[PDB]
Amino acid sequence: LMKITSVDIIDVANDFKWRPVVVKINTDEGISGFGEVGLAYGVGASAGIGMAKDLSAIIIGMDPMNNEAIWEKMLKKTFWGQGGGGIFSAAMSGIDIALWDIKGKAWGVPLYKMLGGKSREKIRTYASQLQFGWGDGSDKDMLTEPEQYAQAALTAVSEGYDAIKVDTVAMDRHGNWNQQNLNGPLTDKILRLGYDRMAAIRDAVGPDVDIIAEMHAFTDTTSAIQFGRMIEELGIFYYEEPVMPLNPAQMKQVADKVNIPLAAGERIYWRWGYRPFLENGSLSVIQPDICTCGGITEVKKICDMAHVYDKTVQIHVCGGPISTAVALHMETAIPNFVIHELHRYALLEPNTQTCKYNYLPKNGMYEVPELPGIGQELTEETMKKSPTITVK
């Protein structure tokens, strides 16, 4: 049997703010696994590093082949595991991913096969976050006008995407992001702008291009209902994060009043996190992030449990190539996949250059990696220039 000998927690140096963090798990047989901690944006990345560092201390000396036992150890033997949480879970996730990488390298087998094989040959993708533009030379667009939203959609369509996602509310008319109060009942003008932008897209792309309406949970229950009712007639594919998950009854209230399938999951963690949303019937599409919401071991369980309640799965992807890789593996294997999320930045050099292999979509579709393990690793150059903590 192999033994974990050290773990590196890598604060990935990049040219893009943006803080991808990688877990590299090392064995006495010289097989190393790579995982990603999914807190690259928002406020928390330093906490993910210290969390990954703290959890690493407790797995040194263990057999990395025992992912189920290691997952449950991190849940049950850490004290704070049993109260749950996003920082806790994201660090767990990176470690878990790295254990599956090792597992696949040990056997010479790509992740998807270890998750039950090839349930589909190609992965349908959508162009994500169109409020920030699409196409080359759109690298920091802050779109304000309906016509600009329509044009970004059309550019994505011309690139072979038959689905887009967009938050049309959170940018004000002056290009300020998320600086208005969108909680409670809102004056018509605040949401009419969002409506006109969305209706411009639909008018431009026609009925056979799917549109996902993303709210980022910047709205609350009331404003999420008010906006969702407005966009109902636009044929919305699903309605993402209308409200935060802290009281699951609020999501149910949105679902009761808005006739569009709801999606959430990037901020819902583990099977326990999803449970109340499966039981209350509020979600149609679930969006766990493999790098945030529990790792490969737990997200597979999530997807399997959600199938009982007829949910389909769009993995949330907002990190480095490692995050993309593991998402493609999961989406390839599961029966209840719907669509993959592609950010514009994920195609770009400062992202792709961090890692050894470059998997890119063609005509709106990905194919799964075929190398042993997750099929993705940081380059040596990135590791050399990235501040690193090493636990042994």
- Return binding residues for Mg(2+): 214, 240-241, 266
Q: Nearest distance from residue 321's CB to its own copies, in Å?
A: 21
310 forms part of the interface with its own copies (CB under 8 A): yes
Q: Which of residues 56-75 bind its own copies (CB under 8 A)?
A: 57-58, 63, 65-69, 71-72
51 forms part of the interface with its own copies (CB under 8 A): yes
Q: Three-state DSSP class for 343?
A: strand
- What are the b/e assignments for 256-285, b being 16+ CB within 10 Å? eebebbbbbbbbbbbbebbebbbeeebbbb
> Quick one: 341 or 355, whose CB is closer to its own copies?
341
> Quick one: 49 or 355, whose CB is closer to its own copies?
49
Q: Nearest distance from residue 154's CB to its own copies, in Å?
A: 18
Q: Which of residues 346-385 bind its own copies (CB under 8 A)?
A: none
> Quick one: 292 or 355, whose CB is closer to its own copies?
292
Q: Which of 91, 157, 166, 169 binds its own copies (CB under 8 A)?
A: 91
27 forms part of the interface with its own copies (CB under 8 A): no
29 forms part of the interface with its own copies (CB under 8 A): no
Q: How many CB atoms lie within 10 A of CB 251?
A: 25
Q: Which residue has the tokens 């039950």?
A: 116
**Residue 351, CB half-sphere, CA atoms under 13 Å: how many?**
20
160 forms part of the interface with its own copies (CB under 8 A): no
The 3-state secondary structure of 21-52, one letter per residue: EEEEEEECCCCEEEEEECCCCCCCHHHHHHHH
Q: Which of 309, 343, 365, 367 binds its own copies (CB under 8 A)?
A: 309
- Strand 365-366 versus strand 123-128 pairing type: antiparallel
Q: How many CB atoms lie within 10 A of CB 29?
A: 14
Q: Nearest distance from residue 93's CB to its own copies, in Å?
A: 13
Of 306, 242, 239, residue with least CA distance to 271: 306
Q: Does residue 217 contact residue 166 with C-beta atoms inside 8 Å?
A: no
Of 391, 392, 388, residue with least CA distance to 21: 388
Q: Which of 36, 162, 240, 331 binds its own copies (CB under 8 A)?
A: 162
* Residues composing the chain: 392
Question: Which helix (H) or strand (E) segment is 56 a member of?
Answer: helix 45-57
Q: Which of residues 241-300 bind its own copies (CB under 8 A)?
A: 243-247, 249-250, 253, 257, 259, 261, 266-272, 275, 279, 281, 284-285, 297
Q: Nearest distance from residue 139's CB to its own copies, in Å?
A: 22
Longest dimension (CA), the chain: 65
Q: Which of residues 185-214 bind its own copies (CB under 8 A)?
A: 185, 187-189, 192, 207-208, 210
Candidates 26-34, 221-229, 343-351, 378-386 — which segment interacts with its own copies by CB under 8 A? 221-229
Candidates 132-140, 167-175, 234-242, 375-383 — which segment interacts with its own copies by CB under 8 A? 234-242
- What are the b/e assignments for 345-380, b being 16+ CB within 10 Å? bbeeeebbebbeeebebeebebebbebbbbbbbbee
Specify binding-site residues: 214, 240-241, 266
Q: Nearest distance from residue 117's CB to its own copies, in Å?
A: 3
- What are the b/e assignments for 286-312, b being 16+ CB within 10 Å? bbbbbbbbbbbbbbbbbbeebeeeebb
> Quick one: 329 or 355, whose CB is closer to its own copies?
329
> Quick one: 68 or 147, whose CB is closer to its own copies?
68
| Cα separation, 169 vs 143, whole angstroms | 11
Q: Nearest distance from residue 150's CB to its own copies, in Å?
A: 18
Q: Which of 2, 60, 172, 301 binds its own copies (CB under 8 A)?
A: 301
Size of the site for its own copies (CB under 8 A): 106
